[PDB]
Design a protein around this nucleic acid. Structure first.
Ligand SMILES: [Mg+2]
Ligand SMILES: [Mg+2]
Ligand SMILES: [Mg+2]
Ligand SMILES: [Mg+2]
Ligand SMILES: [Mg+2]
Ligand SMILES: [Mg+2]
Ligand SMILES: [Mg+2]
Ligand SMILES: [Mg+2]
Ligand SMILES: [Mg+2]
Ligand SMILES: [Mg+2]
Ligand SMILES: [Mg+2]
Ligand SMILES: [Mg+2]
Ligand SMILES: [Mg+2]
Ligand SMILES: [Mg+2]
Ligand SMILES: [Mg+2]
Ligand SMILES: [Mg+2]
Ligand SMILES: [Mg+2]
Ligand SMILES: [Mg+2]
Ligand SMILES: [Mg+2]
Ligand SMILES: [Mg+2]
Ligand SMILES: [Mg+2]
Ligand SMILES: [Mg+2]
Ligand SMILES: [Mg+2]
Ligand SMILES: [Mg+2]
Ligand SMILES: [Mg+2]
Ligand SMILES: [Mg+2]
Ligand SMILES: [Mg+2]
Ligand SMILES: [Mg+2]
Lengths: 102, 99, 63, 70, 46
RNA sequence: UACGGUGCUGAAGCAACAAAUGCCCUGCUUCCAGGAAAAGCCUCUAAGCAUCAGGUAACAUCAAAUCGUACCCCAAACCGA
RNA sequence: CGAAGGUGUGCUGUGAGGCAUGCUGGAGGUAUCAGAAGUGCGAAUGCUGACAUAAGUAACGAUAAAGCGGGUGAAAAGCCCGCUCGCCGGAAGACCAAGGGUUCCUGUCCAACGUUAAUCGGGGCAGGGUGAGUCGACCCCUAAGGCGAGGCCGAAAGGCGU
RNA sequence: AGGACCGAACCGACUAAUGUUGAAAAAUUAGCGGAUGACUUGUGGCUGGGGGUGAAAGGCCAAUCAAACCGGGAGAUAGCU
RNA sequence: UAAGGUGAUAUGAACCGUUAUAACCGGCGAUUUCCGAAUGGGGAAACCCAGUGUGUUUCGACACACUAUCAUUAACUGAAUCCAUAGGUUAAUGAGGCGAACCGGGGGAACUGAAACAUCUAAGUACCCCGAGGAAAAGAAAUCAACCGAGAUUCCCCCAGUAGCGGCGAGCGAACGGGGAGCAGCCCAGAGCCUGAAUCAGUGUGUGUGUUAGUGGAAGCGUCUGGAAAGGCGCGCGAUACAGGGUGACAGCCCCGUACACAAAAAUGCACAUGCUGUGAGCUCGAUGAGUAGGGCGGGACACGUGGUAUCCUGUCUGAAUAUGGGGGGACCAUCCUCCAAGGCUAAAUACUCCUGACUGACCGAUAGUGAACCAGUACCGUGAGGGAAAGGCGAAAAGAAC
């Protein structure tokens, strides 16, 4: 149920955000889903062999997995996944309404 | 039929400890830890041949282990082996040691 | 060899990554991890490679 | 103990004092052993009596054949 | 005093230890009563 | 000197007497209850060998593999929770 | 705009109980009517868990008792150093087998374990540590006894044994 | 010489005290009997439950014995509590 | 099949991958140390030791392969004795061990009940032991019925808790006949005519399906509350799908799916259709199951406890007819009717569940439900067989608390 390749200007149907686009993603089957949609703050203790404290805490691999609408030249939504003939066949790689790739 | 001998990989890295190097002061006898089924005779050639050392006679041991990493229940053994080779003062190795 | 690249001649010669092609692994064999300089790629790609070539033998020879 | 021909042995039955008891019993048959084949040499065998006759009835030799295919 | 047990690891297996088990009729069963029937990780020694 | 110990150096180093349940002693004496076995070892030949191989001795050399070896052990490491 | 469960209050019924509601709680709960039941415990020297009581009581394991000065440390009667003192010495010493299976040595740490304190330990976590042609086991040999080709027996299992 | 005598080790348990939620599920303390013998002990082996072993007490057969322990028939049966 | 990956506690590191060849899933294959039937001898399982070969050999020697017992056959040998057996060697074949229930066979308790207890009961049960299969077993009348007839075995309903058996106590307990599930019948006991067509066993292949990965698959907004919307309100759309689960609360339209339609290099279950091999078929004339049938004695099985007891079986002693002969028709006799024993084979309905997939439950929800939701048959306890626990929850997400 992976819905991203190298970049997916997603939205945020729910999750403290309205529709903040993003990247990274990395959604999959056994792994996570991280995008600027969310981020937080609290650094972790660093005893000093070396100051293993670069410092600065914000998002790392913030939550929010699948269930996220991807980019569309217009508004939002537009669930992808349709399927086309030939054109690789390594994946349906199409789009709802009219479009395929961004 | 060719002898299934690990002509090369019979041993592995050297042990290394307090006895290490201080043992070298004795007769340039270094340790190195070989695999279980070693047989000194298989070690002799192992070190001299290919690794250019020209040693003579060994020792070899065994040794086990046993610990407990996580909280409760989790424990084991581990085994291992020892070796000491020798290396006559004559045939050296242009020793691969330093500080 | 690599993959299909492996199917060619019949000499066990290629099957010598152990001799003078393995001594390299021997050095970086000291635990306590000593040797962090840069691209310290001391992962076993060669031992996994010993098979394949260890295979094919029969492919041509017997089964 | 199995009688080579017309094979038989230790069947079990019970006793009867008519009054009280049904203690289990056990049978057996008959040991004994003779025979000597007039077609080669005296091969013998341990057989029951009612087992000897039978053979000696019209076998005696026409019966070793089954032991062939023991 | 002398508790009822004492040691000896060489006198035990000659009573229990699959050679002592498998050698006996019902004995081979003892391993099945555990291994097969049950699920004992390992049970047969001193 | 780290306080545990270390490197160097280093005298005399014999006689007399006294003992054992240890050794000569798998002995000697004696007794009745009359006191394992098999291999090594020595030797004798069989079949076989039949200028050979083997045998004995001297020395020269190679080989002697593999496991165990830490510590407790009349006890705080074993049998008694 | 707070379900269940938990804890108070008021009203209500003949009663087993019902309702409303304040507080806690963080998700579900079920008028009515009908239906199926693991349907209601104080007792069974009842099962399981938790907590009392006695009570800060007895006891701290041989009556071979220990004193002092330093050191370390948050703290020393107990640990390290030192001088005394006492105890064992056919042993309370030393070595090995049996059995145990890292308890050995070094560094560390003191929660739990040490019948107290613990900087100390056979405790925790790390490392290190047992080197053989002559010692032992393998290995030749056989004892008691075991197993046992074929074999003799025996409903089967199996017993005996060259 | 001796199932001889006094007596340690070793083997055993006649007496008293203590212990009796013990140091201890049979011991400690002071005495006590045997101590070249039907002695005593290490290692391993052989006898299996109605069976073994027994210088005999129904004693011993793993803190269990007028019929061991474990699993089963089993939710035995219980006019009793 | 793919945009992501090198299982988990397990991150870190070093890497592998990305508009046609990482990783993952499925098929086939390769490798598969050692112990274990264990199989070269041995053996306190994971180890000790050996014989015959082999290559390399830096030519020292070492690593690997085979050498268990037993049976069928064959080949070679070869005693007491002329031969001849016995016995030895070899080779190929197969067997051995392990298993959940169900199945057949050998052996076979007591508690308990009878308010005691010996007949009897529990019960052919528990247990032990042998053996085989996806099923076993059974099975084509020497059956039953009554003078009409039915028609192998098997299982279900009923006859009936009846007839009957029984210290006629306890208790045991049918069948005839009737309704159903499901249905096939054939071989040898032997010689010709024809002659490889029926039909069986196993292989070959070809279609069609089943399975062992998969592909696609619909349709949401705005606003209010809120930390979070699926929730309240308003306006829409899909529907052969509104099963279910997930998603910071309760979502048909966000995610996975869902109906529905499609899919296989290969590997195979199974159908058919026929090739090959083995098999035999159809018909004329023949035969037509003896230590057996019966019987004495002793036991057992029949619902049936020897009874007035038929029928079946056999340890022991006997012993017939061969077809107008023989068996049965519940002591026995006559008559009548019925059926041919002493050879064998056979699918289905029937039994079970170690295990695989799908799907369900007025089934439990953490001293409940499996002993075990969790690194449980673990820790522990015992010499041993054997016994055998406890133990789930932060949160929406670690934001697990820099300082
Ligand atoms: Mg030592
Ligand atoms: Mg005690
Ligand atoms: Mg009480
Ligand atoms: Mg006090
Ligand atoms: Mg008081
Ligand atoms: Mg007081
Ligand atoms: Mg006091
Ligand atoms: Mg004390
Ligand atoms: Mg330790
Ligand atoms: Mg110490
Ligand atoms: Mg320690
Ligand atoms: Mg050694
Ligand atoms: Mg024997
Ligand atoms: Mg005397
Ligand atoms: Mg005394
Ligand atoms: Mg005396
Ligand atoms: Mg003994
Ligand atoms: Mg006792
Ligand atoms: Mg019992
Ligand atoms: Mg019963
Ligand atoms: Mg009871
Ligand atoms: Mg073997
Ligand atoms: Mg063997
Ligand atoms: Mg009674
Ligand atoms: Mg899909
Ligand atoms: Mg008629
Ligand atoms: Mg439970
Ligand atoms: Mg709870």
């Amino acid at each position: 149920a992976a819905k991203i390749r190298r970049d997916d200007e997603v939205i945020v149907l729910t999750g403290k955000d309205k529709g903040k686009r993003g990247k990274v993603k990395n959604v999959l089957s056994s792994g996570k889903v991280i995008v600027e949609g969310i981020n937080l703050v609290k650094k972790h203790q660093k005893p000093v062999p070396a100051l293993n404290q670069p410092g600065g805490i914000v998002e790392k691999e913030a939550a929010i997995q699948v269930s996220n609408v991807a980019i569309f030249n217009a508004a939002t939504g537009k669930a992808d996944r349709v399927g086309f003939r030939f054109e690789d066949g390594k994946k349906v790689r199409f789009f709802k309404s009219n479009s395929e790739t961004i | 039929m060719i002898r299934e001998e690990r002509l090369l990989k019979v041993l592995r890295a050297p042990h290394v400890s307090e006895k290490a190097s201080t043992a070298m002061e004795k007769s340039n006898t270094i340790v190195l830890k070989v695999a279980k089924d070693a047989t000194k005779a298989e070690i002799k050639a192992a070190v001299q041949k290919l690794f250019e050392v020209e040693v003579e006679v060994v020792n070899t041991l065994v040794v086990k282990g046993k610990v407990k990493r996580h909280g409760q229940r989790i424990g084991r053994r581990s085994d291992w082996k020892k070796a000491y080779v020798t290396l006559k003062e004559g045939q050296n190795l242009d020793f691969v040691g330093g500080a | 060899m690599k993959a299909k690249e492996l199917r060619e001649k019949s000499v066990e010669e290629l099957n010598t990554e152990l001799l003078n092609l393995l001594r390299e692994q021997f050095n970086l064999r000291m635990q306590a991890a000593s040797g962090q300089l840069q691209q310290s790629h001391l992962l076993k790609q060669v031992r996994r490679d010993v098979a394949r070539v260890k295979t094919l033998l029969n492919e041509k020879a017997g089964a | 103990m199995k009688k080579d021909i017309h094979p038989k042995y230790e069947e079990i039955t019970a006793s009867c004092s008519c009054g009280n008891v049904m203690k289990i019993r056990s049978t057996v048959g008959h040991d004994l052993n003779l025979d000597v084949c007039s077609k080669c040499h005296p091969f013998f065998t341990g057989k029951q009596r009612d087992v000897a006759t039978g053979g000696r009835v019209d076998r005696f030799n026409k019966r070793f054949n089954i032991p062939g295919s023991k | 005093m002398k508790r009822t047990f004492q040691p000896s690891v060489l006198k035990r297996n000659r009573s229990h230890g699959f050679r002592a088990r498998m050698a006996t009729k019902n004995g081979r069963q003892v391993l099945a009563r555990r291994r097969a029937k049950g699920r004992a990780r390992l049970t047969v020694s001193k």
